[PDB]
Amino acid sequence: AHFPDTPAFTGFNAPSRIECDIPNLVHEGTIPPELNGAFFRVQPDPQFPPRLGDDISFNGDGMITRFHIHDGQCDIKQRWAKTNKWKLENAAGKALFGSYRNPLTDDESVKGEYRSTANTNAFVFAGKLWAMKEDSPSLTMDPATMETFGFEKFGGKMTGQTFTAHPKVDPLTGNMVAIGYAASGLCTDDVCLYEISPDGELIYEAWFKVPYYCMMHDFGVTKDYLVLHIVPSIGSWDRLEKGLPHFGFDTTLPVYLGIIPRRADLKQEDIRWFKRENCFASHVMNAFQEGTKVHVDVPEAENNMFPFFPDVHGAPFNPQQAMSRLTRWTVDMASNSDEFDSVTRLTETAGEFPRIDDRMTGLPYRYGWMLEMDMKRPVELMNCLFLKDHQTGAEQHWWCGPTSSLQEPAFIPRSKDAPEGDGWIVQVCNRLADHKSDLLIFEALDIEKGPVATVHLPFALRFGLHGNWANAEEIGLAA
Amino acid sequence: AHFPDTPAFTGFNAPSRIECDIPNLVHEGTIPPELNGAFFRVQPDPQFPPRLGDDISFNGDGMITRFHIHDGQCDIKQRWAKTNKWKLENAAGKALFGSYRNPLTDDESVKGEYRSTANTNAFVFAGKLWAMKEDSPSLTMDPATMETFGFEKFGGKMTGQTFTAHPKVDPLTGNMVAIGYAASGLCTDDVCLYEISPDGELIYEAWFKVPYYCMMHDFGVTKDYLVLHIVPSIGSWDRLEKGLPHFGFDTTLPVYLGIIPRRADLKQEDIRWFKRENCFASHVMNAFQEGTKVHVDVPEAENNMFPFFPDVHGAPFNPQQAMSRLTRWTVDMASNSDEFDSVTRLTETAGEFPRIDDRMTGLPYRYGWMLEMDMKRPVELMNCLFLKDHQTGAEQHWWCGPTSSLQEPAFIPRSKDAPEGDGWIVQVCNRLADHKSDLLIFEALDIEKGPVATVHLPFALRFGLHGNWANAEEIGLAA
Ligand SMILES: COc1cc(C=O)ccc1O
Ligand SMILES: COc1cc(C=O)ccc1O
Ligand SMILES: [Co+2]
Ligand SMILES: [Co+2]
Ligand SMILES: [Co+2]
Ligand SMILES: [Co+2]
Ligand SMILES: [Mg+2]
Ligand SMILES: [Mg+2]
Ligand SMILES: [Mg+2]
Ligand SMILES: [Mg+2]
């Protein structure tokens, strides 16, 4: 393959496209014998050179990595998420779909097809592996064989066009809670709220509209509510016609937080929109209710965090204003005005990729993990694992050293009934000087002493998005 | 896996154990559209940590790499050679066989089993892939699927215990010509000569004895003769009982060159042994006849080339005396004495891994390729590809640069009837600074301008031994 000599395809961003199997990877330390399950994660990884001769990182085909941990050892299985895009281009031996979220650049032979790369999350639910991309229904796969099933449209009961890559699981019911924005077509202001039973059946789909079309990448879920931030990374057909990146950031637009009842009978009039001054937030650590208030914790930045989705008025990217810090947004459903109740920074540590013990989804919670960027460390990057204790305020930091960087952590509970945070953190470490990757295993509430096990991969993973642990019994692997 | 922190298992020698598939590898330059076939090579690569807690490179399990070149692109498929050793240890989840060529260190549960790692050659013949190790019958595999068949004992017609890893193909008949030393048991002085028909049937096996048991790793073949150098890298049960490496080098023993008729009715009395002063040679570029003389070209060194098979009188390893140079050994079957007719250095370039256009096996020939060690180059190693022209004396050199090293080249003929050397060279390049490997493609008689195509692998291969090209129609791949 002749790939472009551009930053998105060279160095750490060289295409990999490895499908492989390796049991019993070389490792150091002690892998807890308690661990019996697998960590799934996804990397964008282009099957083919881009039609245009350049592209962005968020547009690579989804490649799924599975780390099966059992019997004190770690195995790897890596396979493509075989989206319709993947299959069609594989059959043709060439790229057919074009630029990011831009159907005007597709070959005529794939007009109307799902454009999903399934490259944003590798999520386990209802016995399936979900390879997810927010512009289409989710792909599903067999978590044991990692063969691909296809797109999940829930027996035709789903009528929206799209499905999130940030599903939540409500610990009260076991339901998956999801959204799908641009639900009636590209750049539309329609959004669907979905709930899926533990057995994988669509319970309900509820339609509503948002103040403006924008990237609705993540969201919060509480017992009663969908908690949906409206942040002006906006797109339009006009932008696509002019050859601009689909999304650009508009610093002049307000930010909203919508509180949307989790009800099949939802009507537009039931929704409250709170309004604040322009800022940027993408991910949600957790949301929860307190009396008539709703709290949601997000990494907040002063300005755009996506340089490839540039300022719509032509401003150059500002890295300092892109530094995000975990911040609590609080709104009161009983308040008279549309103002937030408060906006409270929770740490001065800069970071992203927030995570919790997902058994606390929608509930008051004590622990949050993040990828931290400590700019005071030597670099010879997201260079630390960070743990915040909301009860005491205490913070822990683990630095990966001066030639490495880190990927998103994922929490592994010790048992169904264990206390919050009782378990382990796993995360990929980019050993940049060695052009390889490690999988790190930490004791989840004692990270400053470093990982208790380091699993070496004999090759490099690419930049990853989201990932999740599932116990073996949930994914068809051995007891 | 917990592997030792010793040189044989760290750095460039870290275990890899990657089984993978990647079509359409990232590449630069132009892959000749004429190419339609595959290059097979083997790396020792330990499935399990060694029982003793250390080991040598030559004892790693064989991992087979296939580079399928077609339609201007290059694909990789990599799979284990599933020897009985591999299967038994895989079933047990642990190492069962011990030190190199030392059955005294094996677990009692595998006494008497073939100890082969199939780690020295990946050879194509009679529609099969041969994964070869000189202490056992060859393993065979499907060259298209790279599944393993098992050990080849030719329907019981082979009674020797062992089969070489340096088979030759006689261009006159298409027969595979092979030896097997220690043919009646470890450290015995019996050797078998084998010829195999193009259809894979054993034609004959002929037994003889050698002046002393030693590592008979390679050999030459001419129309009339097996050409067998006797070089005193010797082994013994006594050495094994004392915990020494199987082989050690004895500088006080003579070197012999045996000329053995290629005849099923061979008797010991038919053999001529020529004798010379102590030296070291392992590999054979080619051998051929001229009148009543026999010529064989070998990389000759003054002393031992294997530091892990040390001097038997305790001398420290001497790297300068290990530097080998292509040298022609000439004997005359009509000579009265046992002296060589001549010993003639053919180049002052130091090198190993000699190769030819294998259509010239056993014939007078013009071209020879080698891996060269140019110690005058900056190193920031086997660092050059070398081509010798025996007709004009001319030499070509291509340097891989100051952070790389090279593996064995292999010649690809343009067509069955093309002139000698008309075709391409392929070889793996170790990009040590990048911790990855490339496959290089050269125009075989024009190497100084560098490769015409560079195929990037997104991971590192380990040190390799021998490899071979086969056209697609010989290995069940597409026309
Ligand atoms: C990996 O692809 C995407 C990632 C994100 C946020 O991290 C937003 C949109 C994408 O398409
Ligand atoms: C890769 O294993 C071997 C290699 C050699 C010579 O290169 C001799 C004996 C072996 O077992
Ligand atoms: Co219903
Ligand atoms: Co995300
Ligand atoms: Co016969
Ligand atoms: Co050899
Ligand atoms: Mg269904
Ligand atoms: Mg501002
Ligand atoms: Mg047979
Ligand atoms: Mg001498």
Those residues whose C-beta lies under 8 Å from the C-beta of residue B98, and which sit 6 or more positions away, are B50, B51, B52, B104, B105, B106, B107
Query: Of B459, B368, B328, B392, nearest to B63 (Cα)?
Result: B459
* Adjacent-strand bridge partners of B392: none
Comparing alpha-carbon positions, the chain A residue that sits nearest to B78 is: A20
d(CA A15, CA A460): 10
Q: Give burial (CB, 10 Å; 0-12/13-18/19+) of A258.
A: buried
Integer Cα distance of B388 and B397 in angstroms: 9
- Residue B209 C-beta-side C-alpha neighbours within 13 Å: 7
Tell me how many helices (H) and strands (E) chain A has: 2, 33
Q: Which residues of B touch A463 (CB under 8 A)?
A: none
Q: How many helices (H) and strands (E) does chain B have?
A: 2, 33
Beta-strand ranges (E) seen in A182-308 are 190-196, 202-209, 220-221, 225-230, 233-235, 247-249, 255-261, 272-276, 280-281, 286-290, 293-301
What CA–CA distance (Å, rounded) separates A341 from A466? 31
Amino acid, res. A264: A
- For residue B108, give the 3-state DSSP assignment: helix
Q: Which ligand sits nearest to residue A57's alpha carbon?
A: 1
Cβ pair B349, B325 in contact under 8 A: yes
List, in sequence order, every residue forming a beta bridge with A66; answer none if it has no partner.
Answer: A40, A77
| Residue numbers preceding breaks in chain A (C to N > 2.5 A) | 380
Q: In terms of Cα–Cα distance, which of B397, B402, B343, B394 is closest to B370?
A: B397
Report the alpha-carbon distance of residue A363 to residue A365 in Å, rounded: 6
Question: Quick one: CA dihedral B47, B6, B371, B278, positive or negative?
Answer: negative
Inspect the interface and report whether the beta carbons of B15 and A436 lie closer than 8 Å: no
Q: How far is the CA of B464 from the centre of ligand 2 (A)?
A: 10
Whether A78 and A20 have beta carbons less than 8 Å apart is answered as yes
Q: What residue owns the CA closest to ligand 2's atom 3?
A: B58
Structure tokens at A198: 């533990």
**What is d(CA A62, CA B290) in angstroms, rounded to the nearest whole number?**
62
Look at residues A160, A122, A119 and name the one whose alpha carbon lies nearest to residue A141: A122
Distance (Å) of CA B153 to CA A104, B136, B163, B193, B195: 63, 10, 9, 14, 13
Give the whole-angstrom CA distance, residue B359 versus residue B470.
13
Q: Are B253 and B246 a contacting pair, CB within 8 Å?
A: no
Nearest C-alpha neighbor of A131 from the set A183, A51, A61:
A61
Going by C-alpha positions, the residue among B354, B361, B349, B443 that lies closest to residue B393 is B349
- The two tokens of residue B408 are 């064995």
The 3-state DSSP class for residue A171 equals coil
Q: Which of A467, A22, A254 is closest to B48 using CA atoms?
A: A22
Residue A189's alpha-carbon distances to A221, A267, B86, in angstroms, are: 20, 15, 59
Three-state DSSP class for B158? coil
Look-up of token digits 């343009």: B414
DSSP structural state of residue A313:
T
B465 touches ligand 2 (CB under 6 Å): yes
Q: How far apart are CA B104 and CA B51, in angstroms?
A: 12
Backbone angles phi, psi at A9, to 5 degrees: -130, 15
Which residue among A13, A42, A58 has the greatest number of ligand 1 atoms within 8 angstroms of its CB, and so is best to mutate?
A58
- Cβ <8 Å between A27 and B435: no
Q: Is B185 helix (H, G, I), strand (E, B) or coil?
A: coil
B356 with B166: CB under 8 angstroms? no
Residue B230 Cα, ligand 4 centroid: separation in angstroms?
A: 66
Distance from C-alpha of B326 to C-alpha of B350, rounded to nearest angstrom: 8
Query: Phi/psi of residue B201, each to 5°?
Result: -95, 140
- With b for 16 or more beta-carbon neighbours within 10 A and e for fewer, the B5-28 pattern comes to eeebbeeebbbbbbbbbbbbbbbe
Helix, strand, or coil (residue B239): helix
Q: Dump strand ranges (E) for A135-246.
A: 139-141, 148-151, 168-169, 176-181, 190-196, 202-209, 220-221, 225-230, 233-235
- Residue of A464, A462, A438, A463 lying closest to A451 (CA atoms): A438
3-state secondary structure of B37: strand
- Pairwise CA distance, residues B20 & B61, whole Å: 17
Experimental method: X-ray
Find the CB nearest A26 among B14, B434, B435. Answer: B14
Closest atom of ligand 2 to CA, residue B133? 11
DSSP letters, A3-21, are --SSGGGSGGGS----EEE
E strand or H helix at B440, and its extent?
A: strand B436-443
- Give the distance from residue A20's alpha carbon to the nearest chain B alpha carbon, in angstroms: 4
Residues B446, A398: Cα–Cα separation, whole Å: 54
H or E segment and range at residue B85: helix B84-92
Q: Which residues contact A379 (CB under 8 A, 6 or more apart)?
A: A402
Number of residues written out for chain A: 479
The answer to whether the beta carbons of residues A438 and A450 sit under 8 Å apart is no
Name the token pair of A4: 């472009």
Helix (H) or strand (E) holding B21: strand B19-22
Question: Which backbone phi and psi does A21 adopt, to 5 degrees?
Answer: -140, 125
Cβ neighbours for B472, distance < 8 A, ≥ 6 positions apart: B36, B37, B38, B70, B478, B479
Annotated binding-site ranges of A for Fe(3+): 166, 217, 283, 466
* Alpha carbons B205 and A38: distance in angstroms, whole number: 53
Nearest CB to B14 within list A15, A21, A458: A458
3-state DSSP percent of chain A in helix, strand and coil, to 5: 10, 40, 50
Q: Which of A239, A148, A223, A146 is nearest to A187 (CA)?
A: A239
Quick check: A458 and B456 CB within 8 A?
no
Of A14, A22, A73, the CB nearest to B17: A22
Q: Is A242 exposed, middle or buried (0-12, 13-18, 19+ CB in 10 A)?
A: exposed
Any idea which residue has 């102590």 for tokens?
Answer: B278
B145 Cα to the center of ligand 10, angstroms: 48
Place of tokens 């050797």: B191
Please report which residue ranges of B233-358 form alpha helices under DSSP H. 237-241
Nearest by CB: A18 against B2, B28, B458: B458
Q: 3-state class of A269 per DSSP? A: helix
Q: How far is A244 from chain B (nearest CA, A)?
A: 28
Please state, as a whole number, how many other Cβ atoms lie within 10 Å of the Cβ of residue B318: 14
Q: Classify residue A172 as exposed, middle or buried by CB count within 10 Å of its CB (0-12, 13-18, 19+).
A: exposed
B10's CB contacts (< 8 A; 6+ apart) are none
Taking CA atoms only, the protein residue closest to ligand 1 atom 2 is A58
> CA-based angle B296:B300:B304, to the nearest 5?
135
Q: How many CB atoms neighbour CB A346 within 10 A? A: 17
Nearest to B215 by CA among B129, B290, B302, B120: B120
DSSP labels for B340-398? Answer: -SEEEEEEEEEEEEEE--GGGTTS--SEEEEEE--TTS------EEEEEETTT--EEEE
Say how far apart CA B28 and CA B79 lie, in whole Å: 25
The residue among B220, B202, B193 whose CA lies nearest residue B125 is B202
Q: Three-state SS for B322? A: helix
Element (H, E) at A89: helix A84-92
DSSP 3-state helix, strand, coil percentages of chain B (rounded to 5)? 10, 40, 50
Q: Give residue limits of the domains in chain A.
A: 1-479
Per the structure block, which two tokens stand in for B309? Answer: 């098979």
Show me where chain B is broken: residue before each gap, C-N > 2.5 A: 380
Separation CA B307–CA B311 (nearest Å): 8
**d(C-alpha A443, C-alpha A449), whole Å:** 9
Report the C-alpha gap between A125 and B377 in whole angstroms: 58
Question: What separation, in Å, do the N-terminal and C-terminal C-alpha atoms of chain A show?
Answer: 42
Q: Token pair 């590798």 is at which residue?
A: A122
Specify the 3-state DSSP secondary structure of B90: helix
Given a contact cutoff of 8 angstroms between Cβ atoms, the answer to whether A405 and A430 are in contact is yes
- CA–CA gap between residue B119 and residue B134 (Å, rounded): 9
Letter for the amino acid at A205? E
* Rg value, chain A, Cα: 21
With the most atoms of ligand 2 within 8 angstroms of its CB, the residue from B42, B58, B102 to mutate is B58
